[model samples]
Target: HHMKVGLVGWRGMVGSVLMQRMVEENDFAHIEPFYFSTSNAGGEAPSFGGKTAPALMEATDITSLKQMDVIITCQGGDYTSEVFPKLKATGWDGYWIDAASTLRMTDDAIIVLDPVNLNVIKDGLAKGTKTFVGGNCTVSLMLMGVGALFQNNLVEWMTAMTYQAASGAGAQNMRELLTGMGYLYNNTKTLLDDPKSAILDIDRQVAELQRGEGFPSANFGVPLAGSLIPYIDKQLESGQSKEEWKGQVETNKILGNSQIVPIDGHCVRIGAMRCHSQALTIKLKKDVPLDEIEDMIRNSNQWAKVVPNTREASMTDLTPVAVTGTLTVPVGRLRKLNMGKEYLGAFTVGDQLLWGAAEPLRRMLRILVEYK
Candidate 1:
């Protein structure tokens, strides 16, 4: 209850989810919570735990910042770029728990996903690792679905084709997607009204609106509501989008092995509001029975569920809409791939802001406090 936690960006998308999760779990009842803001410093604090909070503090205030036992930041890399190293230079011997990718690949920072890799975190803590970062949204969700295979040394290779949500891009993109969706519906509703009109006619009108002006695409760089963007994040040196590259490296990194399973992927941006889905093809080291594999995946964690590979189960259980805002990782479409007996196929969906981003950050904080 005496722990001091400086919470930065608690008003953003992931931050807001974290704030809700903490409140739902009554986390404020234990620790000392200090809200931080770059623009709203000295402003009114959020009311939490039935009490009015104190005024917000400057996120960059080194004196007050260094006094905390832990700092949890979701303010993005730009802020981390300016303040993280500066705080370290002040000899602040406190843990840094960040939800950004700024320091994830660093040697001293461990990606925290205790459900699958508590061992990695425990070993890192034993070795005096003070900096912890949440895994990439796609990477974390992937592990949440199939991490038992990796933990059991059963995976040889994996491929992920991601159907990411608008929320992954940030708040502005989320609004842009909604606006573009309305634009699409508003313009196409008349064609849809004509029962005699061919679908191709309606399709033509949709295409014109999608290709012509007046479609909102500024935040996403394309119309993501009526259509989808085949790429995500910035271009990387490896000819992969930064989002795609994260799935490859971050999966292995969090598992404490460098490129052990050679996971690769295409990450596409979709119109879904809050959930991200992935179609995966996994290569097992050997041909294991489907039932055993299902048991392995289901028993790996508390939230992962192995939905049966049936029309009713998959349509109802395995979907972005079904998993949005929930911690459940529903992985269905379990079957052997046509490639070979050792090749397996699965589909998984998870709430982007939950295990994909915020849940790990929140749980890692619990470990730091409760474990002690």
Candidate 2:
């Protein structure tokens, strides 16, 4: 109850979700919160927990930052690089929990997704681990849906072909996706209104915008509405995208197994605004029964729901549209893959901002409170 929890990036997208969840969960009932702002440091605070917040503190100031028992940041990676180590060297020994990918794979930090990896977190806390970072949104949400397979020691390998949303990039990019969609619709509005119009001609109008420079691409760097991006992050030396590489490395780190269960995947971006959907192909170590896998997934987490492998249920429950803005991680389209008896195919979806980005940080804060 005496814990001073300093919050940064509370004005941004992921941080907005964190603040909303905190208010809904009545998190202020247990710990005190100090809001920090990177830009409007002295600005009036938004009302949270039905109280006028204190004037925001300067997030860059080490003196104020050193006072908190815990500092949770959803700041961009750029800000993290400047602040985190300086606070460390300045003798601030407070727990640092972050949503940025900056320090996630570092030796000093553990990726916190407590619902799926509570043992890893509990073990890390006992070992004096003070730095915690959330994993990639895809990785975190993937675990939320199918982590029970890993927990049951059923996974041998996985291929996560992801349908990531524009929100995964930035709020501006997500807005741009909408802008691009609007522009596309307006461009073809005349044709869309005329049922007699040629389909190929309308297709030409759509293709030209993506091919030309008139599309709203300042944030997305390309058209993202009518078309999808095959790559999420930059490319690495191995010709794999940085986002794809995270799918492997981060999953293993969260599971506390570097090479135990292999993961490889391509992270693709689509027009979906907030939720991310993934087509997962899992290779089990054994030929586990479908009923058993479903039972394991169901028991793994309260939010992990197994939609039945029926068309009606999958269409009803297992999708970005149905899963967005909620904490639920729904996995469905379950069936045995034709590759082999041990190969399984499933689709999972979750709100990228919730389980993927914000929820882990929020839950970690609660863990800190309980530890106190």
Query: What Cα-based lDDT does every candidate model obtain?
Result: 0.90, 0.90
Task: Give residue 131's lDDT in candidate 1 (0 to 100).
Answer: 98
Residue pairs with colliding backbones in model 2 are: none
In model 1, where do residues sit more than 4 Å from their true spots?
Answer: none
lDDT of 1 by residue, 1-372 (tens): 468888998988889999999989988877888888999999998866654557999998888799889999999999898999999999998999999999998998999999999999999888899999999999999899999999988999898998999888888998998898888889999888889989998899888898887887888877888787888988988899888888768888899886467888899988899899999999999999999999999899989999999999898889976898899999899999898989999999999999988999999999998866
Q: Which residue pairs collide, candidate 1?
A: none
Q: For residues 66-127, could you state the per-residue lDDT of candidate 2 as single tens digits?
A: 99999999988998999998999988879999999899889999999998899999999999
Evaluated against the true structure, the overall lDDT of model 1 is: 0.90
lDDT of 2 at 110: 97
